[PDB]
Design a protein around this ligand. Structure first.
Ligand code: ADP
Ligand code: ADP
Ligand code: ADP
Lengths: 84, 374, 128, 42, 50, 187, 50, 373
């Protein structure tokens, strides 16, 4: 039914010294030992409704641009676009 | 207002690869080494570099002590690893880290502190909007394009076998072996000692790694190959040092990678990679085994020696029952295959709902990585 | 050998072409931005890699962007004087807590393409 | 055959322990001795 | 000039080898498919007679 | 236990390490009365931590894994096996018998073997088998303090009976009947 | 040296393009194999019960 | 019983030789070969092409000293033949045809060294049987225990090997090219700071005598720097052969400290204490507490006063605190290898393990890898 995933440590939220910060909270400060994560059903990582053809179609689309050897470059930031 | 393509960053031990999502091949490939000077600087007016990072550090190997931030797939120096990540983001890809999502890879059986520290140092320092951690072998099988197979990824640092049947991965059948390229480099140094050549410094360890990459192969029959090497001197090759000195290897060409199949040379008592794959297959259920015998996938740089596929097919056929067909799938560009799969997983429209958001991180802490990703 | 030959052909085709094509366009946009800011002091750069070797253009660009006086460059045409000028510029970037990795005077002086592009991108992103 | 190729098996350690003590006895007793004399000399 | 000459001689060699292996793989590959085709027709006949 | 000790960072791979891990299991393990409550208790504080000293001299703190290793006895889905736990196994074994004899079978449940020496195994076993059993029936578990050797003790009883002298398979009988004498002679 | 390296450049550029197509051809044959085997095996099983 | 065997230890610095079953070697002499370099004018004094061993030490003024063994490797085989002939005929006065010989060499060495040694000892001296052994295993014989890690430091090379219950782990053997000759060269380098200059090969022996007489290992390095800077109580005076008087002072504990910090020589490698600790950690878990209790020092280089306390303190610092570290240094640890050789050479059960002459004739010189170790 339920599968348990253990974490040997515990992180504590600490205010900025705004940006969120998390803290180790080592064992000298009497922190909690084992943090449990419960999974009550299989295949929770994958969405339930999915067409199998889509992944293979996109694999073909990506791969044959090597075959046709494109001149495409990566995205550019907009701070460069503004000065133009 | 189109969504910007994510960044795919593959980090095994000993090499870092990075590129944009939706592209065929990564933009940047560079070794994951960091060096620091050891000698005294006497010329005034020189540049003040505390640490040489990445490929640049391999240019001036003579005056640095090279170190690796990852040992056996475990990041043992986080502040050092931050330098590789910063150099990747700002100098090679030169992209703003706050503007794109980042996808990362790791080994199967790792301490949870590795994943938690990766998530914490990615959100807190580089200030990414979203991130995800994906297992490498699943990405490689994505790159192969089949929805069912067993994949054995052997890279510098680690070797691991996972099976997948119809999109389901059995967790108890995952096997992990700490026999990798760095151990083979050390064994190559040890056996090159008795020929008459001595290498001690890490700068010479890089040279030994280059010799291993350039001149090695795997023999189909080990005893016959040793007898042939003893009878005649035809199996001999020459190499030139950066100093400039012709050395001749001879017998040691096919003995360095043979330690992959017989780990007793190193003193380790573990089984070979062929028996590791066989034991992973036999741990699975019966009705899938035939399919797992027909879809063996090799991945990683360590599987790039010539003759690995034929030797592994012969050995598995010697172990498997005779009535089944054993096929070994080895793409020519398999060394990059893991990264390629990541790009596909970064380009699916279905995947876009499963990025770990910054907002949910703010209330779930760095422990959301165990709940969200596999 | 055939698998290795095809694999390294895949590298030297795709990896090399993508990286080199990206750096060409990125260099052109960067040098246009630098010429845009350097018109105020009436200096301009034709090539990004060659003109930054002396280091006076970098000092003038930091003078433009910061709006405050840097130390004067040493009037020397030696190799070590070029290293001195580039070190002065990098040090001036160093007091104002702009983070740099793998940045050295000889990296700019000998003309490393990725390092020069990274320095220009860092100046663009973190200063303006 | 490969683990213990270099040594013969089933040997008592007490023999080696006896011989070390026998050699140490000469050091304790300060014995005069000469080397073996050759047959061709004889 | 001499360095980039060494580069491009290596290029000649590598992709010559790749042409070798690829053409040989195709030419050896064609014979097997015909054997599969003949087996299917003979197999059907044995089914229908029984 | 060796697989789940990998998650904390400690690694054990050879045969001697398996012997060391078995010693760790024999020293520091127990079965929780309630899995959810004990897991939340370990989530609250750090009172469920023990330190074991390796033969190398290193000290490890296993902590949460003390009651997760024996819990695979009651929930074999951790290992991926299809079969369910021991308590419903003996419940099905009872249910395969006749209705008239079940009353004696509930009151005479005896535990034996090395694995059944985990602390708190009797209470958890009794609670689970009482949850499975009908409410009108009474449950009695029998846990000998020397259960680990009890089988051998039974053998010492069987070799002392005077009627047992008739049970022995004679050497002459074996020489007459081959190795297949044991099926017909031994029940 | 410069001119000879430039002259050999066109040959590498053109018969690299020659290599590219033959790659996809052998990939197509590798695809064609498998479904031939599976139709063989199902036909054999039906024949057996006949 | 029959004829006794010969035990010969050929380190890089000095050669030792004796009869098996003896407590101490008969012949101990330096492994050098000297040849004259000046003009000879006195007619009728006779000629002498080479000076071997101790004879070259007394007349070292007019010779160029040369070492046949360098870093544990035999470079010039002719001088090795000369040394072996001198050992057999002038020092022990025995015919080599009647006696078997047992030789010693380093753990990790080129194969051709062993092959050529076997070919030389069979082809020229015509010995009936011979054997090759690792020096540190013989040290473990000399100690008399079945379990321990042994670290041997000679004039050519330093090596650590652990052995448990008679089984030696091959992957845990560590070799380091830091020995007494490197320390002698470093002493020659740091004696320049006070004004004394030694250049030729004759003065290298004077520097070696200075190092053997007036050097010691500091327990705490920085505290000794503070003490030597504060006062002049650490200075000692030495007399040169020509009659001049030198005074070392600070350099007494800086030369042997370089073993623990090889960065003084420019070497990247770790110190001897870290090498021993790493070689211990390379072993398995169950034998580590036995290796902590049986560390054995061997070789002449470990004859500095105060080496044991420094080694014990360093390894105690590196190891976990719950276990005890003891370092077993016998007072006669210079000759330990040779003593072990004797203990091996006349065991009753060892007599079946000699390489026979017939076996060499029918197998070539390659038989030494199949036997020995
Ligand atoms: N062409 C090659 N032939 C043989 N071995 C190689 C080759 N390329 C890389 N290797 C080995 O593979 C290792 C690199 O593995 P890699 O796949 O980069 O690991 P990761 O990608 O997980 O960091 C190197 O240590 C090297 O020893
Ligand atoms: N005191 C104990 N606590 C926990 N487990 C134990 C204890 N004693 C034994 N075991 C487990 O039981 C096993 C021994 O079972 P045992 O009854 O001896 O098997 P058998 O007698 O059938 O061979 C050991 O491997 C150990 O894992
Ligand atoms: N009493 C001593 N004190 C300090 N160092 C010594 C002493 N005796 C010898 N040494 C050093 O040891 C070297 C000789 O070591 P030795 O045992 O002869 O090596 P090997 O026998 O392996 O050649 C000398 O060069 C010297 O540097």
């Amino acid at each position: 039914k339920t599968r348990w995933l253990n974490t040997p440590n515990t992180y504590l939220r600490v205010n900025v010294a705004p940006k969120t910060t998390w803290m180790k909270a080592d064992e000298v400060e009497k922190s909690s030992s084992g943090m449990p994560i419960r999974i009550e059903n299989p295949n929770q990582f994958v969405p339930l409704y999915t067409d199998p053809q889509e992944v293979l179609d996109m694999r073909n689309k990506i791969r044959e641009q090597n075959r046709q050897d494109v001149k495409s470059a990566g995205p550019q930031s907009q701070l460069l676009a503004s000065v133009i | 207002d189109d969504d910007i393509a994510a960044l795919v960053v593959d980090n095994g031990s000993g090499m870092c690869k990075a590129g944009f999502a939706g592209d065929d091949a990564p933009r940047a490939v560079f070794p994951s080494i960091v060096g620091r000077p050891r000698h005294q600087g006497v010329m005034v007016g020189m540049g003040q570099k505390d640490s040489y990072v990445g490929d640049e550090a391999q240019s001036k190997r003579g005056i640095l002590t090279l170190k690796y931030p990852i040992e056996h797939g475990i990041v043992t120096n986080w502040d050092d690893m931050e330098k590789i990540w910063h150099h990747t983001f700002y100098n090679e890809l030169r992209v703003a880290p706050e503007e794109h999502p980042v996808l990362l890879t790791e080994a199967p059986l790792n301490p949870k502190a590795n994943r938690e520290k990766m998530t914490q140092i990615m959100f807190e320092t580089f200030n990414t909007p979203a991130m995800y951690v994906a297992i490498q072998a699943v990405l490689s099988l994505y790159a192969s394009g089949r929805t069912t197979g067993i994949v054995m990824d052997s890279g510098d640092g680690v070797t691991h076998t996972v099976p997948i049947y119809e999109g389901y991965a059995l967790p108890h059948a995952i096997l992990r072996l700490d026999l990798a390229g760095r151990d083979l480099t050390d064994y190559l140094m040890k056996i090159l000692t008795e020929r008459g050549y001595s290498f001690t410094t890490t700068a010479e360890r890089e040279i030994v790694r280059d010799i291993k990459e350039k001149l090695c192969y795997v023999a189909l029959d080990f005893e016959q190959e040793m007898a042939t090497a003893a009878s005649s001197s035809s199996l001999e090759k020459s190499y030139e040092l950066p100093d400039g000195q012709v050395i001749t290897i001879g017998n040691e060409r096919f003995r360095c990678p043979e330690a992959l199949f017989q780990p007793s040379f190193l003193g380790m008592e573990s089984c070979g990679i062929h028996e590791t794959t066989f034991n992973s297959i036999m741990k699975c259920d019966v009705d899938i085994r035939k399919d797992l015998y027909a879809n063996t996938v090799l991945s990683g740089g360590t599987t790039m020696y010539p003759g690995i596929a034929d030797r592994m097919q012969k050995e598995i056929t010697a172990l498997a029952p005779s009535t089944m067909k054993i096929k070994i799938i080895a793409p020519p560009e398999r060394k990059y295959s893991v990264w390629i799969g990541g790009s596909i997983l970064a380009s699916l429209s279905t995947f876009q709902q499963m990025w770990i958001s910054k907002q949910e991180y703010d209330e779930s802490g760095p422990s959301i990585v165990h709940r969200k990703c596999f | 050998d055939n698998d290795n030959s095809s694999a390294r052909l895949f590298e030297r085709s795709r990896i090399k072409a993508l990286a080199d094509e990206r750096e060409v366009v990125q260099k052109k946009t960067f040098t246009k931005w630098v010429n845009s800011h350097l018109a105020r002091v009436s200096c301009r750069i034709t090539d990004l890699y060659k003109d930054l070797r002396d280091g006076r253009m970098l000092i003038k660009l930091l003078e433009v962007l910061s709006g405050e006086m840097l130390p004067k460059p040493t009037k020397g045409k030696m190799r070590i004087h070029c290293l001195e000028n580039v070190d002065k510029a990098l040090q001036f970037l160093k007091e104002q807590r702009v983070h740099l990795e793998n940045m050295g005077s000889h990296d700019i002086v000998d003309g490393n393409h990725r390092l020069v592009l990274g320095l220009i991108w860092t100046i663009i992103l973190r200063f303006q | 055959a490969v683990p213990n190729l270099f040594v013969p098996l089933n040997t008592n350690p007490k023999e080696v322990q006896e011989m070390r003590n026998k050699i140490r006895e000469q050091n304790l007793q300060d014995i005069k001795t000469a080397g073996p004399q050759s047959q061709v000399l004889c | 000039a001499e360095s980039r000459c060494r580069e491009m001689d290596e290029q000649i060699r590598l992709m010559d080898q790749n042409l070798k292996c690829l053409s040989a793989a195709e030419e050896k590959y064609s014979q097997k498919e015909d054997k599969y085709e003949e087996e299917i027709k003979i197999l059907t006949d044995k089914l229908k007679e029984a």
